[PDB]
Amino acid sequence: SHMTAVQDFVVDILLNGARDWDVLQTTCTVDRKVYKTICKRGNTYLCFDDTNLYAITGDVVLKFATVSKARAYLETK
Known part of the structure; x- marks a missing residue:
């Protein structure tokens, strides 16, 4: 597994549309790295890599321990 949880999460924004x-x-x-955003709300940009997601709040990378964390983030700030 890899493009499994991350994938299925990402399309919930990408085709299906977010919060x-x-x-x-x-x-x-x-972080001297580039992350791929799916969705932007305000000054925040929800992005994913090979492993998990991150919220970038402006310049503030915030690694999630999961993919599903970013889903519950999307309804919460």
Whole structure:
């Protein structure tokens, strides 16, 4: 598994559409790394890598321990 949980999560924004977030296909740059956003709400950009998700709040990378964490983030701030 890898493109399993991450995948299925990402399309819930990508085709199916988020919560109150804009559905943005851009990639963000933080931590001297680039992360792929799915969706933007305000100053926040929810992004994923090979492993898990991160919220980038402006310049603030916030690694989730899961993919499903970012789903419950999308309804919570």
